Write a protein that binds this ligand. Sequence first.
Ligand code: F29
Length: 350
Amino acid sequence: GAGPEMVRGQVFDVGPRYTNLSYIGEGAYGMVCSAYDNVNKVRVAIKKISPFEHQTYCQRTLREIKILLRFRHENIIGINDIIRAPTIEQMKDVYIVQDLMETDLYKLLKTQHLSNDHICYFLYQILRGLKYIHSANVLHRDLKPSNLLLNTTCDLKICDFGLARVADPDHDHTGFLTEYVATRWYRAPEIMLNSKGYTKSIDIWSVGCILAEMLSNRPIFPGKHYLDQLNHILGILGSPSQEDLNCIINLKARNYLLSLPHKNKVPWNRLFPNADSKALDLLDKMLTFNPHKRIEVEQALAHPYLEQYYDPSDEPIAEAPFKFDMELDDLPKEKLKELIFEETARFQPG
Ligand SMILES: C=CCn1nc(N)c2cc(-c3c(-c4ccccc4)nn4ccccc34)nnc21
């Protein structure tokens, strides 16, 4: 019949239900291939994950799965199936299945022209999904053009929740430059300064970034990371006002910004010659330095720019929000595995 298949060395045993495998991405430990579902008449994407030997990897997996199974929304990727061993000791890896989409927003920015109507569509769908995730008291914490999948009819869907978690604004403060492995440039400025990214505002900043990249049809954040990057952002938005400085109740982060030379604000309209003014309005409000002054999803959705798509009654919220204690490691790899096992129980016959 079938049996453990091969790609580029690793074992991708997912048939007979899924066949005709095609490698898609490295992913370090996690390997994604495309396949074909034989039971249903559809094409699919499937990721083989093999954590269990590292508590940090188990963190990611449990988050992606748990959250994604709990969620049910058109603009959020849905898990079709999960292949894994019937018992715990036999379980060494997890194969997650999803609808094969087509491409991601990062590739579109780098190879296609994004017109006004398209940018408006994508932005709306991104916010609609984000509205639901925030209503569930969840923060994505890693939004980027690569985490936004699209099909051939332009329907967009958010996907990677490996870094997502329950908001928690009361513990958002962390102290100047303490690092946090992520690898990107779409993360909010305050995270580098005095925050650990525990509030909704972090996702909004991200969305704002992808809106700007969509507007210039290229990645605005290419090279130069951490501080260098922050200085460039300030060179665009303008130096933080004293008002803004009150928010920062920490001498180290506060003083560092005082260290920087005066930067004049560079209006977006002078950067994007032919660009809808309403779009620039939304941009400016989404990309503000002070997270507190930053616009919320509700506001964004109702902004004039999205006027042709806006419809509250067709923009559902969670249904089952939460607020668990697992947060921030503090949990043996073994227990995580147990939890992961239970979490995937629903896909095994019974
Ligand atoms: C978008 C073009 C093709 N394609 N279609 C998908 N749904 C798809 C998804 C992904 C994908 C998956 C993933 C794949 C299978 C099961 C669980 C998670 N995780 N993931 C994490 C970061 C960025 C992309 C991505 N990478 N390529 C894909």
